[PDB]
Amino acid sequence: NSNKELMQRRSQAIPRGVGQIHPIFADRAENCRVWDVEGREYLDFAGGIAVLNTGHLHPKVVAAVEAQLKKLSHTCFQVLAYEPYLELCEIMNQKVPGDFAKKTLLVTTGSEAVENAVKIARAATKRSGTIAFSGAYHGRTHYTLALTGKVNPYSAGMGLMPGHVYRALYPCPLHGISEDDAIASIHRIFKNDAAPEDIAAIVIEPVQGEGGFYASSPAFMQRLRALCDEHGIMLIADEVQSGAGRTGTLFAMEQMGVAPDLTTFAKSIAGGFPLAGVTGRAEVMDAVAPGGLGGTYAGNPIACVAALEVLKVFEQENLLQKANDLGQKLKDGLLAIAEKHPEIGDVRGLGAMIAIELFEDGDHNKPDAKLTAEIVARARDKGLILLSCGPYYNVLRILVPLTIEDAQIRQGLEIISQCFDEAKQ
Amino acid sequence: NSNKELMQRRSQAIPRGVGQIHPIFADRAENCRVWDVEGREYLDFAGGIAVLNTGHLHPKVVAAVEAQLKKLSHTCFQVLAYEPYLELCEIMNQKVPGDFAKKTLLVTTGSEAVENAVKIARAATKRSGTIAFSGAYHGRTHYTLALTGKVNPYSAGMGLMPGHVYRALYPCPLHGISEDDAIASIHRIFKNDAAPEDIAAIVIEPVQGEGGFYASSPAFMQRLRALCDEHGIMLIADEVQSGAGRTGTLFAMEQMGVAPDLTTFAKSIAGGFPLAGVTGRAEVMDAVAPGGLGGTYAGNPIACVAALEVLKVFEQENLLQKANDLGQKLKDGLLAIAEKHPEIGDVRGLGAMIAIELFEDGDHNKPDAKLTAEIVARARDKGLILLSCGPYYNVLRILVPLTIEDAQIRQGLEIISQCFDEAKQ
Amino acid sequence: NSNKELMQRRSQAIPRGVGQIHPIFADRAENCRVWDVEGREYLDFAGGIAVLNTGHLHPKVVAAVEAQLKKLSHTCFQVLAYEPYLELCEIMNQKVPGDFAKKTLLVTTGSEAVENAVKIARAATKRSGTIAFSGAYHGRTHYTLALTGKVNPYSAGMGLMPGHVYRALYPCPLHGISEDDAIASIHRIFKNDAAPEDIAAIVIEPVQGEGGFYASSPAFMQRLRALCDEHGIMLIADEVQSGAGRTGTLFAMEQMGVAPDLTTFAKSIAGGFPLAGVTGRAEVMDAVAPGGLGGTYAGNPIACVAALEVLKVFEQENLLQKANDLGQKLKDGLLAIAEKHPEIGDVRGLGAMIAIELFEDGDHNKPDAKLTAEIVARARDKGLILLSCGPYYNVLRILVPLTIEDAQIRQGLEIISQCFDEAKQ
Amino acid sequence: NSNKELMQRRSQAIPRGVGQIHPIFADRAENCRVWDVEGREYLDFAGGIAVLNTGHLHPKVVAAVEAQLKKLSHTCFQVLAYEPYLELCEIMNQKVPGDFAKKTLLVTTGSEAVENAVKIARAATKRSGTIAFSGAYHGRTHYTLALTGKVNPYSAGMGLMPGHVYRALYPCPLHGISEDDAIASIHRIFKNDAAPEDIAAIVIEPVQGEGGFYASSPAFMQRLRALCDEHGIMLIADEVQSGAGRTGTLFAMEQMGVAPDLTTFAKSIAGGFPLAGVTGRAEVMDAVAPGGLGGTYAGNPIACVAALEVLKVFEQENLLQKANDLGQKLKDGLLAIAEKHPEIGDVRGLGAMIAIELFEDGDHNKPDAKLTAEIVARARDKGLILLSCGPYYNVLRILVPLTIEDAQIRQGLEIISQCFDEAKQ
Ligand SMILES: Cc1ncc(COP(=O)(O)O)c(CNOCC(=O)O)c1O
Ligand SMILES: Cc1ncc(COP(=O)(O)O)c(CNOCC(=O)O)c1O
Ligand SMILES: Cc1ncc(COP(=O)(O)O)c(CNOCC(=O)O)c1O
Ligand SMILES: Cc1ncc(COP(=O)(O)O)c(CNOCC(=O)O)c1O
């Protein structure tokens, strides 16, 4: 019943490989509030890593879950079907962008969704290679670790991950990688390592998550769509983190002016219950023969009803508009703090997928990982839970529930401001 | 709201790759009973594919879940920890066989569990290759599809799965593969394709599941343990399906007389909620550096409290003894039926992990997949839900909850008896 | 100028990885005679590892080489062509078995020939995987080491060789692998790891060379041809060692009753000059696009005229018949020796591809590698150069030139007899 | 006889995959002249693709070959050794740059040399990955095709080549890739796809050959050497084409100011006879265990004496100085032609490794492959044999023997000058 006592028990019972960002054991939570085992209250700006866009235990979501719990929790869909799985698939087919008919597969984790999107693209194109981008993050299974553009620590010490995954550059002007450089890096793969006829898919996060909250511009995404179209390559949009409304539209691709062939989703789709999925061009989804897709827990009944309710909540509570309003208030406030702290070299974000990036004395070539970690620690001491990201660990991101109250927005920005003021001296 | 209308909607919204064993939409369930959307009642001998050893919605499990729903459903353990994850790890470290210190990681699906056990073995041994057995089944991610000893349909049409996974023969006297043949096939790998110094682990199901309910003998497992010891190879016991009490002991390895270095578990561990994990020798588990293990939903709070309750139920309701008793009653009944049906060439199984195998005119080299499929269909028509398995699709398995009523044991065996009598008419 | 001083210099200038079977420096040679730097004369029963079926420096071969040396030694065929390359390709299209149009590519080494046959099959079938057999030997490049069914020492310590090469069992009744077992091991790969639709070729040595001089029966080869036909898979006959007349026919496949799609050849094709090549069904050979095949030294002019002359010598000197006569004389003498030494557990071979296998106390389960090495060393001391082979290093092979004189046959057999008698004193 | 008649026979007996740059069949050649079967005389500026630095059939080389031909042509060194192989290794150990003990392995082709250098690096570092550069060319075996930075046509239509080969950018200011971009691309691989501890070697051509005659600067090579040193990575200099004197020093690395760990050589090392090898840091070479290195024809006796004689000729005839003088005369002559032809956008090269690059309207972004091909064809009609190179096929390279006389230098430049004038007419 103390965080420290539980941390000691953790070190003796759980491998050190599972890191602990905050050495705190949560006991209960509601919307943006979390209480630890000692009764201390925190304001949650991490949202369980973008999983709680509708807040901890949204009452509508919980009541849907409680009703399903009276019916059944598991049959394994492939054995005996159930309606919540079917209804969610129909809804995702309508909401994921694309003017063609789509089909949806439900699985359980984001890594599984990416795994399956790739398998489907391979079966549909009869090709085996894939292309992913620098700083990308797609999961912790062997193949998704290969797709993830970061070896340490995700796959550190394990030897080489699966081959035949080629690396393109993610466009990022802030750090000198132009859209031209990014597209040229894909043609480079075609010419040097894997011809287009051997590439089943190009996988991309419309807004990189663990990679630093860097967004693709519609122009880049349009050139990418054209390049895939030219070569029969499937464009896979990994919206596990950017999806379920974080960017102000349900899916970030809606803001890109083009539709991907396959979209993966998870995290906030079910507001705190284990569910993930893949929605894409119906004929591409159907390339795999019966028995080729599935999973024991896939599309768990309770999680399906939670997701159907999350989508209803977005509509009833106009959370997309709130995401945009929230993002503006956050950026306005961070820009204000940036006026007094040159270390804040960039304030950015689509909708509520907001981040700031820190540099030693403002030099874009010197990521300040130290100040970043210090701000995360100081915030925690003030009762605010934050996460950093980026290949250089100098990006601070905000993933607070879209259901946050106005007073809490001011409260969080004030704490952050205090952390930077106090970090000096 | 008829099964037919829902199947039509399925064809429009969900990929055909997700097979539908039974064209039925379940509406609600309780213990061993499932009711479809039309109100028809069925006896569930599939148990959601060995996930419901405590039955659908065990009341104790559901009450614990309902209580946790008033606290929190998700924080992402590696961000903010919580006690149910910790407690379950402590208990698994004690319950998994091996008289030495252990640690446990929780993830969400069985495939993720196997993925992590291999990543851990690789980090621990500083080697990259793995060996798996003929007919094995380990999951649907790219790497676990490579480990899985069956291409069609699991990875059919997708091109070749990850390399550096080698194939040994699973011992099966019924089909002419002796234990010597099995051990020799491992040495063959060492000599022809991958030396011991490049093999991080040998992955094996103590009792193959999708592969036909073929169990390893203690003598064979002991020879394997010695072979791994000699070469510094990690022995990974995949107990995703054999575990959580199906064979009469919590883990089948308990009946082998030797302990693995790592064990995967999932399915019945949480009685119908998404949870999986890996428990192993502490020093092996600790080989991965911080940040190297994780997952967004991993050890979901609700699923953890469900697992803790499943473990108490096993103890309180004497479910291990019941598994053994149930298995004896099932085999006795199946043997009686076999006296009248030569096609049943084998009746086998540890605990309640029971199966019968069909051969044309009891000819061991002639797998009778048509009869097997006919029995499954005749059983559904009589209200009994069964699954077949085996590389040749001729094994009928029984995975009915261990909480089955005495009358239902009689009912299922009687229905199976009628199916064989009516198929022979 | 002494063998010992040259061996000391060798230890300082050349990697220990290049083994040295005999610590002798050859100075000159003629037909089956070799003289070292110390003037000692030896009888060559190794033939430079089956490279000298026409003997060291056959006078007709040397005369052709001398005539070509006056013209040119290299232009790179793909840059400026030359007639000897063209003429040899025309002849091999006719000589290689297969009653259909063929085309031929010339390269330089046997490993390059195998590499090319695989590249060609992959382009022809649009598939990436290959199957090779236990104990096979196909060369020392990364891919041919993967095809090679022996890790130690060929690829020992280098980490895992290229993936997507699967292992079947070579038929060998002497060691309990029946033809049914061999064919079943192929279906096992199709079911467990790589479907036929992903297998471009099955690569096989009609008579395994480094593997122990084990020969496929015509019945087995016919079943393999039927299996390949059914699945659109290319049958590649690696005749680098079995070819150029060693078995009594120019190519061993001629005795199998069926034709492969692709044949590799090297070693004795040019009687001691660097040349290798691939001959196959015309439509298969033409699947690779222009520029996809080549090599700097490929089809070297001097080696081409040497090969053209070697083929003429085979016709003029009736070497195919001599091979069969030599083989019988050798086997007869070896059988005579086996009557006094039970350790000789088998005497076998097609044509002049002769071997005996040694067992500790006639026990086929106890390969006698120590005695084998002892016989090689004793023979060397008596002036006879021999080589062993076999995955267990207990096979003595004879690859003496087909041009050997009758008295030398007796001389060699007598030496081997003395070696076994004295090893046993 | 006729070139066209021979081309027709070629189309019927040889696969189209073997391209034919010049549809001409050579009959005889001497120094820089070649005569076809129609008796027409050509000036050879291709040198059999840089194999004839000492010219066709240098008399001293031929005399050495003739002397060896009276002794023996093949024993397979690893069976029975011979002095020429030993003597050549001793000399290469001292002449390849590196102020430390080296050992040398001889094989037969350049692709085999690169294959072995990587196998040796892998065994020495106990790592399996490699890094190669954009536009690189290393051979036609599966693994060297993966190293080769060009898919079409070298590995076109065959599916994906071996994985675990990562791609860095070769520095080339002319085309916008700075040295900083190049080094940053190596760090990118380390961070995104393969940690340094999994990279056995970085393979680089000091001057890219098929990639366009682009040379590394000493500054870049020094940074690359420092990066390899920091991470324990072996630096492999592929000097198969740049070596044996082409650049003015025996090996190009000598001009870089640093030594590689391993160097591959072939082509001009033996003046037109099949030989290749790897010379490197002794303890790295010795990391492979006995039996782990070899090859049937490896270090062929005749090619060894040819190479020993080529090295003496370089000394006796001052060929390195001549290569520098030749290079200057060529560049001066080409610059004069460039004053009248804007299409020639760059004239470059170290020593006699000279090239010019053609651009449409002198625009660096508009490679002129059509004009380049027209020049090669016109030059041939005028009796001058040329080759092009470069990933965009717009680089004309000159590889004429270093033994060329002044009159022929003038004559070849005049022919080239005419081709450009007549191309614009
Ligand atoms: C774009 C994207 N795809 C895929 C995934 C993978 O989803 P899941 O964690 O549900 O497997 C994630 C998960 N972020 O998780 C972080 C961590 O574990 O350090 C993600 O952001
Ligand atoms: C031993 C074993 N390991 C691992 C797994 C994989 O576990 P999970 O389904 O939770 O990923 C399974 C799952 N069986 O799944 C059947 C199917 O989808 O056809 C399994 O039996
Ligand atoms: C059937 C076969 N294929 C292919 C090859 C490879 O041919 P090459 O050595 O010309 O590359 C060989 C070579 N045997 O060489 C033995 C050794 O080096 O220990 C062979 O026997
Ligand atoms: C740097 C380098 N390494 C390695 C090699 C390979 O050497 P080899 O051709 O002797 O195998 C080459 C050969 N270039 O040959 C051209 C072609 O066949 O199109 C090369 O240039």
Side-chain angles (χ1 to χ4, degrees), chain A residues 9 16 21 26 29 71 73 78 81 90 115 119 140 142 272 275 286 291 297, chain B residues 9 16 21 26 29 73 78 81 90 115 119 140 142 272 275 286 291 297:
Chain A
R9 286 173 63 191
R16 66 176 181 131
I21 308 304
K71 301 183 74 173
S73 74
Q78 293 139 54
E90 290 169 337
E115 284 273 0
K119 284 159 58 184
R140 291 166 182 281
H142 278 78
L275 179 67
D286 271 349
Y297 299 138
Chain B
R9 281 170 60 190
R16 67 181 183 117
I21 307 301
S73 69
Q78 68 207 59
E90 289 173 335
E115 284 272 0
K119 295 192 309 182
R140 294 173 179 277
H142 279 78
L275 178 63
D286 276 330
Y297 299 138

Short mmCIF file of all heavy atoms in Angstrom, two decimals, chain A residues 9 16 21 26 29 71 73 78 81 90 115 119 140 142 272 275 286 291 297, chain B residues 9 16 21 26 29 73 78 81 90 115 119 140 142 272 275 286 291 297:
data_model
loop_
_atom_site.label_atom_id
_atom_site.label_comp_id
_atom_site.label_asym_id
_atom_site.label_seq_id
_atom_site.Cartn_x
_atom_site.Cartn_y
_atom_site.Cartn_z
N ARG A 9 8.50 -4.92 -4.63
CA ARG A 9 7.91 -6.19 -5.01
C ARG A 9 8.04 -6.37 -6.54
O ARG A 9 8.26 -7.48 -7.03
CB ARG A 9 6.44 -6.22 -4.61
CG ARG A 9 6.21 -6.37 -3.11
CD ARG A 9 4.72 -6.21 -2.75
NE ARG A 9 3.89 -7.25 -3.35
CZ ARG A 9 2.57 -7.21 -3.36
NH1 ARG A 9 1.95 -6.18 -2.80
NH2 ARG A 9 1.86 -8.15 -3.97
N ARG A 16 13.45 -6.63 -15.46
CA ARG A 16 13.84 -5.23 -15.61
C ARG A 16 13.58 -4.71 -17.03
O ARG A 16 13.50 -3.49 -17.27
CB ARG A 16 15.33 -5.04 -15.26
CG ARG A 16 16.24 -5.74 -16.23
CD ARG A 16 17.72 -5.47 -15.95
NE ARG A 16 18.43 -6.20 -16.99
CZ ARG A 16 19.40 -5.72 -17.75
NH1 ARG A 16 19.84 -4.46 -17.60
NH2 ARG A 16 19.90 -6.51 -18.71
N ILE A 21 8.06 4.14 -16.26
CA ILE A 21 8.27 5.58 -16.45
C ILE A 21 8.07 6.35 -15.14
O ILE A 21 8.92 7.15 -14.74
CB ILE A 21 7.31 6.14 -17.51
CG1 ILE A 21 7.40 5.31 -18.79
CG2 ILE A 21 7.64 7.60 -17.78
CD1 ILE A 21 8.78 5.21 -19.35
N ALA A 26 -1.11 3.04 -9.56
CA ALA A 26 -2.43 3.64 -9.60
C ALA A 26 -3.43 2.69 -8.98
O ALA A 26 -3.33 1.46 -9.17
CB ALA A 26 -2.85 3.97 -11.10
N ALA A 29 -9.20 5.75 -11.02
CA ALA A 29 -9.13 6.93 -11.88
C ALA A 29 -10.52 7.31 -12.41
O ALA A 29 -11.43 6.48 -12.41
CB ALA A 29 -8.18 6.63 -13.09
N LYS A 71 -23.86 -10.81 -20.72
CA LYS A 71 -24.17 -11.71 -21.83
C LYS A 71 -23.10 -12.75 -22.08
O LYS A 71 -23.35 -13.96 -21.99
CB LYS A 71 -24.42 -10.87 -23.09
CG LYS A 71 -25.57 -9.89 -22.89
CD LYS A 71 -25.91 -9.07 -24.14
CE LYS A 71 -26.63 -9.92 -25.19
NZ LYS A 71 -27.13 -9.14 -26.38
N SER A 73 -18.35 -12.92 -22.47
CA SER A 73 -17.12 -12.14 -22.62
C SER A 73 -16.23 -12.69 -23.71
O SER A 73 -15.34 -11.98 -24.19
CB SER A 73 -16.33 -12.13 -21.30
OG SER A 73 -15.69 -13.37 -21.09
N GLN A 78 -14.20 -16.61 -34.66
CA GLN A 78 -14.00 -17.63 -35.71
C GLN A 78 -14.74 -18.90 -35.41
O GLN A 78 -14.98 -19.69 -36.33
CB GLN A 78 -12.56 -18.12 -35.80
CG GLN A 78 -11.53 -17.24 -36.23
CD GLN A 78 -10.27 -17.44 -35.39
OE1 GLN A 78 -9.72 -18.56 -35.25
NE2 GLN A 78 -9.83 -16.37 -34.83
N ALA A 81 -19.76 -16.58 -33.85
CA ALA A 81 -19.72 -15.14 -34.03
C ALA A 81 -20.57 -14.42 -32.98
O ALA A 81 -21.22 -15.04 -32.14
CB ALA A 81 -20.20 -14.79 -35.49
N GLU A 90 -18.69 -3.01 -39.36
CA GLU A 90 -19.48 -2.21 -40.29
C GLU A 90 -19.22 -0.73 -40.04
O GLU A 90 -19.04 0.03 -41.00
CB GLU A 90 -20.98 -2.51 -40.10
CG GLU A 90 -21.35 -3.91 -40.58
CD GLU A 90 -22.78 -4.34 -40.15
OE1 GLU A 90 -23.32 -3.79 -39.17
OE2 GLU A 90 -23.34 -5.25 -40.77
N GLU A 115 0.89 -6.32 -37.89
CA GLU A 115 1.26 -7.62 -38.41
C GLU A 115 0.27 -8.07 -39.51
O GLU A 115 0.66 -8.51 -40.61
CB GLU A 115 1.21 -8.66 -37.29
CG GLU A 115 2.45 -8.57 -36.30
CD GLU A 115 3.62 -9.37 -36.78
OE1 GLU A 115 3.54 -10.00 -37.85
OE2 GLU A 115 4.65 -9.38 -36.08
N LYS A 119 0.50 -8.85 -43.59
CA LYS A 119 0.18 -10.17 -44.13
C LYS A 119 -0.86 -10.02 -45.26
O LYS A 119 -0.77 -10.67 -46.33
CB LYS A 119 -0.43 -11.07 -43.04
CG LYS A 119 0.59 -11.62 -42.05
CD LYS A 119 -0.06 -12.07 -40.71
CE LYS A 119 -1.12 -13.13 -40.91
NZ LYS A 119 -1.80 -13.45 -39.56
N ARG A 140 6.07 -4.36 -30.85
CA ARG A 140 7.13 -5.18 -30.26
C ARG A 140 7.17 -6.67 -30.61
O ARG A 140 7.75 -7.45 -29.86
CB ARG A 140 7.08 -5.01 -28.72
CG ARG A 140 7.49 -3.61 -28.20
CD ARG A 140 7.05 -3.47 -26.71
NE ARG A 140 7.35 -2.17 -26.12
CZ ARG A 140 8.55 -1.78 -25.66
NH1 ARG A 140 9.59 -2.59 -25.72
NH2 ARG A 140 8.69 -0.58 -25.10
N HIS A 142 8.58 -9.54 -33.36
CA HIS A 142 9.78 -9.53 -34.22
C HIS A 142 9.58 -8.72 -35.50
O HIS A 142 10.40 -7.86 -35.86
CB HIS A 142 10.17 -10.95 -34.65
CG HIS A 142 10.97 -11.72 -33.62
ND1 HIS A 142 10.40 -12.30 -32.52
CD2 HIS A 142 12.29 -12.05 -33.59
CE1 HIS A 142 11.33 -12.97 -31.83
NE2 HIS A 142 12.49 -12.83 -32.46
N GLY A 272 -9.86 2.19 -23.33
CA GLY A 272 -9.32 1.54 -22.13
C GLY A 272 -9.56 0.05 -22.05
O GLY A 272 -9.41 -0.52 -20.96
N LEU A 275 -8.46 -3.92 -27.65
CA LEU A 275 -9.00 -4.14 -28.98
C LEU A 275 -8.12 -3.44 -30.02
O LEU A 275 -7.58 -2.35 -29.77
CB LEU A 275 -10.41 -3.53 -29.05
CG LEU A 275 -11.13 -3.65 -30.39
CD1 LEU A 275 -11.39 -5.08 -30.60
CD2 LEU A 275 -12.47 -2.87 -30.35
N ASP A 286 -9.87 -9.28 -48.53
CA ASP A 286 -10.29 -10.65 -48.91
C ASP A 286 -9.25 -11.50 -49.64
O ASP A 286 -9.54 -12.66 -49.98
CB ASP A 286 -11.60 -10.60 -49.75
CG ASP A 286 -12.86 -10.66 -48.89
OD1 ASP A 286 -12.73 -10.96 -47.67
OD2 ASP A 286 -13.97 -10.41 -49.43
N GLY A 291 -9.25 -19.06 -42.82
CA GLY A 291 -8.33 -19.73 -41.90
C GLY A 291 -7.03 -18.94 -41.79
O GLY A 291 -6.24 -19.13 -40.85
N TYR A 297 -8.32 -14.15 -28.79
CA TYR A 297 -9.06 -13.06 -28.19
C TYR A 297 -9.62 -12.03 -29.17
O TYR A 297 -10.46 -11.22 -28.78
CB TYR A 297 -8.18 -12.30 -27.19
CG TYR A 297 -7.66 -13.13 -26.01
CD1 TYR A 297 -6.34 -12.99 -25.58
CD2 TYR A 297 -8.53 -13.96 -25.27
CE1 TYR A 297 -5.88 -13.65 -24.43
CE2 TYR A 297 -8.08 -14.64 -24.09
CZ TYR A 297 -6.74 -14.46 -23.69
OH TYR A 297 -6.27 -15.02 -22.52
N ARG B 9 -24.54 -10.19 -43.48
CA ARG B 9 -23.86 -8.93 -43.12
C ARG B 9 -22.35 -9.18 -42.92
O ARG B 9 -21.54 -8.30 -43.25
CB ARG B 9 -24.50 -8.36 -41.86
CG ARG B 9 -25.84 -7.62 -42.13
CD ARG B 9 -26.58 -7.27 -40.82
NE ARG B 9 -25.79 -6.40 -39.94
CZ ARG B 9 -26.12 -6.12 -38.69
NH1 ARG B 9 -27.23 -6.63 -38.16
NH2 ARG B 9 -25.33 -5.34 -37.95
N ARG B 16 -13.15 -12.83 -45.54
CA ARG B 16 -13.39 -14.28 -45.56
C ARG B 16 -12.19 -15.00 -44.91
O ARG B 16 -12.30 -16.16 -44.51
CB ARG B 16 -13.54 -14.75 -47.02
CG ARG B 16 -12.24 -14.64 -47.87
CD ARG B 16 -12.39 -15.09 -49.33
NE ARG B 16 -11.09 -14.99 -49.99
CZ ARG B 16 -10.39 -16.00 -50.51
NH1 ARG B 16 -10.85 -17.26 -50.50
NH2 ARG B 16 -9.16 -15.76 -50.98
N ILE B 21 -16.16 -21.31 -38.20
CA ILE B 21 -16.35 -22.74 -38.03
C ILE B 21 -17.84 -23.08 -37.96
O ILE B 21 -18.30 -24.00 -38.63
CB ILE B 21 -15.67 -23.28 -36.76
CG1 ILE B 21 -14.20 -22.87 -36.74
CG2 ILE B 21 -15.87 -24.80 -36.70
CD1 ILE B 21 -13.40 -23.37 -37.93
N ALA B 26 -23.63 -16.06 -31.44
CA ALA B 26 -23.92 -16.24 -30.03
C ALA B 26 -24.45 -14.95 -29.47
O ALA B 26 -23.96 -13.87 -29.80
CB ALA B 26 -22.62 -16.64 -29.28
N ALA B 29 -24.23 -16.39 -22.76
CA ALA B 29 -23.72 -17.69 -22.37
C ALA B 29 -23.57 -17.82 -20.87
O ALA B 29 -23.50 -16.82 -20.14
CB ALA B 29 -22.35 -17.91 -23.03
N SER B 73 -9.56 0.81 -15.83
CA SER B 73 -9.48 -0.30 -16.79
C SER B 73 -8.13 -0.32 -17.50
O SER B 73 -7.71 -1.36 -18.00
CB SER B 73 -10.60 -0.20 -17.86
OG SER B 73 -10.39 0.90 -18.73
N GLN B 78 3.70 -0.04 -17.75
CA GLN B 78 5.04 0.55 -17.85
C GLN B 78 5.01 2.07 -17.67
O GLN B 78 6.07 2.68 -17.45
CB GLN B 78 5.71 0.15 -19.20
CG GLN B 78 5.06 0.76 -20.44
CD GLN B 78 5.26 -0.10 -21.72
OE1 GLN B 78 4.85 -1.28 -21.78
NE2 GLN B 78 5.86 0.50 -22.75
N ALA B 81 2.10 1.79 -12.86
CA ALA B 81 1.83 0.38 -12.53
C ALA B 81 0.53 0.22 -11.76
O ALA B 81 -0.13 1.21 -11.45
CB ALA B 81 3.01 -0.21 -11.70
N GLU B 90 3.66 -12.40 -9.24
CA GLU B 90 4.19 -13.09 -8.05
C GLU B 90 3.65 -14.51 -7.96
O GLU B 90 4.38 -15.45 -7.68
CB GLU B 90 3.79 -12.32 -6.77
CG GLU B 90 4.54 -11.02 -6.64
CD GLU B 90 4.07 -10.15 -5.49
OE1 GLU B 90 2.89 -10.31 -5.09
OE2 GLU B 90 4.88 -9.29 -5.02
N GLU B 115 6.21 -14.61 -28.79
CA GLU B 115 7.14 -13.65 -29.37
C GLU B 115 8.13 -13.20 -28.27
O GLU B 115 9.33 -13.13 -28.48
CB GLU B 115 6.38 -12.40 -29.87
CG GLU B 115 5.61 -12.62 -31.20
CD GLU B 115 6.48 -12.33 -32.41
OE1 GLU B 115 7.67 -11.97 -32.20
OE2 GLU B 115 5.99 -12.43 -33.57
N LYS B 119 12.22 -13.53 -27.80
CA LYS B 119 13.08 -12.32 -27.71
C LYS B 119 13.94 -12.45 -26.42
O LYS B 119 15.12 -12.13 -26.41
CB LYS B 119 12.23 -11.03 -27.60
CG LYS B 119 11.37 -10.73 -28.89
CD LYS B 119 10.77 -9.32 -28.89
CE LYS B 119 10.03 -8.95 -27.66
NZ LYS B 119 9.43 -7.58 -27.72
N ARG B 140 -0.21 -16.30 -34.87
CA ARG B 140 -0.42 -15.67 -36.17
C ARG B 140 0.36 -14.40 -36.50
O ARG B 140 -0.02 -13.66 -37.42
CB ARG B 140 -1.93 -15.41 -36.34
CG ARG B 140 -2.77 -16.69 -36.43
CD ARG B 140 -4.26 -16.33 -36.43
NE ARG B 140 -5.17 -17.48 -36.54
CZ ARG B 140 -5.51 -18.07 -37.69
NH1 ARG B 140 -5.03 -17.64 -38.83
NH2 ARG B 140 -6.37 -19.08 -37.69
N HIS B 142 4.03 -12.72 -37.87
CA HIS B 142 4.97 -13.35 -38.83
C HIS B 142 5.88 -14.40 -38.23
O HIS B 142 6.02 -15.52 -38.75
CB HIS B 142 5.87 -12.31 -39.49
CG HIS B 142 5.22 -11.57 -40.63
ND1 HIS B 142 4.32 -10.55 -40.45
CD2 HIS B 142 5.44 -11.65 -41.97
CE1 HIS B 142 4.01 -10.01 -41.62
NE2 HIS B 142 4.67 -10.66 -42.57
N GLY B 272 -11.71 -15.91 -20.09
CA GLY B 272 -12.52 -15.20 -21.06
C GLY B 272 -12.21 -13.72 -21.15
O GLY B 272 -13.02 -12.96 -21.62
N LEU B 275 -5.58 -11.68 -21.74
CA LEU B 275 -4.35 -11.61 -20.96
C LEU B 275 -3.43 -12.74 -21.39
O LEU B 275 -3.91 -13.83 -21.74
CB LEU B 275 -4.71 -11.80 -19.49
CG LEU B 275 -3.54 -11.80 -18.50
CD1 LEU B 275 -2.92 -10.46 -18.58
CD2 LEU B 275 -4.01 -12.04 -17.07
N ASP B 286 15.66 -11.54 -16.93
CA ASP B 286 16.36 -10.25 -16.77
C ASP B 286 17.40 -9.87 -17.83
O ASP B 286 17.96 -8.77 -17.78
CB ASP B 286 17.01 -10.18 -15.37
CG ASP B 286 16.05 -9.74 -14.28
OD1 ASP B 286 15.10 -8.99 -14.56
OD2 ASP B 286 16.24 -10.14 -13.10
N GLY B 291 13.21 -1.13 -21.17
CA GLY B 291 12.64 -0.57 -22.40
C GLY B 291 12.47 -1.65 -23.46
O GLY B 291 11.80 -1.45 -24.49
N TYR B 297 -1.49 -2.56 -24.07
CA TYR B 297 -2.51 -3.19 -23.23
C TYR B 297 -2.01 -4.24 -22.19
O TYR B 297 -2.78 -4.65 -21.33
CB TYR B 297 -3.55 -3.91 -24.12
CG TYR B 297 -4.33 -3.03 -25.09
CD1 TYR B 297 -4.58 -3.44 -26.41
CD2 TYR B 297 -4.91 -1.83 -24.65
CE1 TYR B 297 -5.42 -2.67 -27.26
CE2 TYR B 297 -5.74 -1.06 -25.47
CZ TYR B 297 -5.99 -1.49 -26.78
OH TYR B 297 -6.87 -0.76 -27.56
#
